[PDB]
Amino acid sequence: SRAEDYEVLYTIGTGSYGRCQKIRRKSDGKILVWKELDYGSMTEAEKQMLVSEVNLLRELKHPNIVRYYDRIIDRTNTTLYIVMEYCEGGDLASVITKGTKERQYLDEEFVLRVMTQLTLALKECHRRSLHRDLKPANVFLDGKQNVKLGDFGLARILTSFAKTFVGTPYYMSPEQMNRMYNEKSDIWSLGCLLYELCALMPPFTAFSQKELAGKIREGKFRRIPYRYSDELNEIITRMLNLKDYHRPSVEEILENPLILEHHHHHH
Ligand SMILES: Nc1ncnc2c1ncn2[C@@H]1O[C@H](COP(=O)(O)OP(=O)(O)O)[C@@H](O)[C@H]1O
Numbered sequence: 001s002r003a004e005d006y007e008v009l010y011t012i013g014t015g016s017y018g019r020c021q022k023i024r025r026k027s028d029g030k031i032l033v034w035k036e037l038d039y040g041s042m043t044e045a046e047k048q049m050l051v052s053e054v055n056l057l058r059e060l061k062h063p064n065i066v067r068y069y070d071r072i073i074d075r076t077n078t079t080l081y082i083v084m085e086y087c088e089g090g091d092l093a094s095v096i097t098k099g100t101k102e103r104q105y106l107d108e109e110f111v112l113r114v115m116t117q118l119t120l121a122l123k124e125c126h127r128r129s130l131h132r133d134l135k136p137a138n139v140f141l142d143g144k145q146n147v148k149l150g151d152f153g154l155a156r157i158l159t160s161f162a163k164t165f166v167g168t169p170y171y172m173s174p175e176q177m178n179r180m181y182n183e184k185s186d187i188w189s190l191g192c193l194l195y196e197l198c199a200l201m202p203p204f205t206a207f208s209q210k211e212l213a214g215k216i217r218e219g220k221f222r223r224i225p226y227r228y229s230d231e232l233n234e235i236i237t238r239m240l241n242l243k244d245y246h247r248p249s250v251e252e253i254l255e256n257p258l259i260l261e262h263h264h265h266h267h
């Protein structure tokens, strides 16, 4: 819990609220990341919210959720560093982009790993209920074929106008579009992600929000590519049902004959 306990190796990327940097823990040489948060402009009330939210982050321990390790205050630069597990495989948005550029669809086995492991991450989120975001850019891969749901973003729970505005809400469920808790809405979002992993495009595309909402409400989309099994297409399609009560529960997903031990985590 001191900055001097770690050495920054390099900046992985700049997020909406600060840099994510690869770091090395001096005690044992463990490779981790930290995320920078500038709290200099925050009120006491906002900082109190931040404290409560960091503590909730610390409570989520699951093989399929990016692990929280530490928090560091650099009072001199009013910077809070949140230390977390490093995921060497990077994010799924990059995986999708790679598939598109290299003109190569992803293995069904990979899609099954994501479905299995993210469903389990969601199961844990539901048990604890908690902001979560299933977009590909927030799902990560380690070096052992494990899939981890990334942190929501402390500042994000708290720039937030910029991308809440500009961005297109590809994964928003029909019911959340009418009015924002519903665990079946997470299943819809999972369906969108899995669909995009298969098709390399989301199930509903549009250039405007109005157009997108129209498509979402109609609930129609192309079949995922034919290289993917009818069984996989079936389950993704069920997750994209207009009726929340027709979408499979976490339990129903995991009972699917597609899902086997090897699709789960192995550390
Ligand atoms: N645990 C992690 N392991 C490896 N890379 C990460 C991790 N978390 C975020 N990244 C990467 O760091 C960069 C910044 O992302 P992030 O810090 O999550 O901010 P934002 O949510 O605003 O995009 C992105 O390239 C992202 O893929």
Ligand SMILES: [Mg+2]
Pocket (backbone or CB within 6 Å): 015, 138, 150, 151, 152, 153
């Ligand atoms: Mg993030």
